Amino acid sequence: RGSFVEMVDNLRGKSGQGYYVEMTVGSPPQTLNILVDTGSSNFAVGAAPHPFLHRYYQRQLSSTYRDLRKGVYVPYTQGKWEGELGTDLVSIPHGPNVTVRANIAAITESDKFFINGSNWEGILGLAYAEIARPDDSLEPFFDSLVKQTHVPNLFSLQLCGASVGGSMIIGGIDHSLYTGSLWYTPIRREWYYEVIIVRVEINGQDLKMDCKEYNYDKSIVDSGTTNLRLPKKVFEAAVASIKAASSTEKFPDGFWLGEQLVCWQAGTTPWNIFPVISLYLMGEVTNQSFRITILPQQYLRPVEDVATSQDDCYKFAISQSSTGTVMGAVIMEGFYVVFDRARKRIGFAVSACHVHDEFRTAAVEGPFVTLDMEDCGYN
Ligand SMILES: N#Cc1ccc(C(=O)Nc2ccc(F)c([C@]3(C(F)F)CCOC(N)=N3)c2)nc1
Ligand code: NA
Ligand code: NA
To answer: Which residues form the Peptidase A1 domain?
Structure first.
C-alpha cells in the first residue's frame, strides 16, 4: 500500500499520440506497447502486419492461446477495427508480479485506428463491461486481473505531458506522485468512468448555466482522448468567456474552433493572458463539492511536427462535443487520478509532475457548499 517503486515511470508516449504501457501476451511472452484508455473496455491488439505497426500479436507462436470462435466489428466516430476474440496469458512487466488469462481481440483489419509513426500497437480498455464489444459478457482485462489475483480493485494514473511519460500504479496509490490531498467524486454509473460536474468557472467567473448542461448526456474521465471536450452549448459559453478574458491579444476565429494553430516566437508564449479553467465535481458528502483547476499549459497543446513554421505553435485543445464532457489528457495531465473501483469513486490530487509556471499552478481545493448536485446528472 502507498509505495510501488517498480511501477513509477512505466508509461511513455509522444505529444499527440497518447500514453502506453509495455505488456506481454502469450507463451513464450510477446512484448507489445499498449495505449492506456480509461474511455473503453476491450483489450485489442494488432495481430496482422499493418505497415504502421512496429510489432503485432502472432497467435500461432503462443502455446496458451485459446480461440473463442467469435468475431467482433467495432466502428467508432473516427475509425474502426475488426478482429477475432480469444484468451491468452497476459502480464505487465513494470506492474504487479502476476499473470492472468484475459480476453484479447486480435485485430485483423482496421481503418483510421492506428497512428502512423506511433509506438503502440494495441489498446487497453480499463473501463467497465457494460461498454465492452460485442456485449457485457466479454470480461474486461482489469476485471479478470482482480478476479484471478490478489491485486486490489483500483489503479491510478499520473500522465506527465510535454516525449511524455507518467505512471500507471496497478492495485494502489503511490503518494510520491502528488502533493496536497486527494478529493474524491462518485462514479455515477459503472460503464465509462462517469462523474458529475456541478459548476464551471473561467478565471473564477461562473458560467451560470443550468448544471445539467455540463453533463449532457454524460461526463467521463478518458485517458484515450487528448482534448477537454464540452457539450456544444457549454463550449459556446466557455469559449466566449475565454475570448473575453484573453482579449488583450486577437486570434483568428478558426483558432478557437481548433481549425488553425497559433504560433509565437520561441520562449515567449504569453501564458499569463489566458485564464484558468475550474470544474467543480460532486463530492462524497451531501451538498459538498470540490474543484479542480487547470492552466493554459494544459489546454494549449504544443504542436511540434509543423514543417512550415520556425517557431512555437499551439492548438487550442478544448472542443465541442456531441457525446458529453470528456475529461481527456488536457484535464488528466494536471492531476494524479485514482480510479478507486472498489469504492466507486475517482480521486484527484495535484500532480507532482504537471507543467506550470512561477505564477500559477493546477489546484484541487475543497470543500465547497453546492446544493441540488443531483439535478446536474442527465437521465
Ligand atoms: N493524450 C492523448 C491521446 C492521444 C491519442 C490517443 C488515441 O489515439 N486514442 C485512441 C485511438 C483510437 C481509438 F479507437 C480510441 C478509442 C477506442 F479505444 F475506444 C475511441 C475514442 O476514445 C477512446 N477513449 N478510445 C482512442 N489517445 C490519447
Ligand atoms: Na482478487
Ligand atoms: Na504526496
So the answer is: 19-349
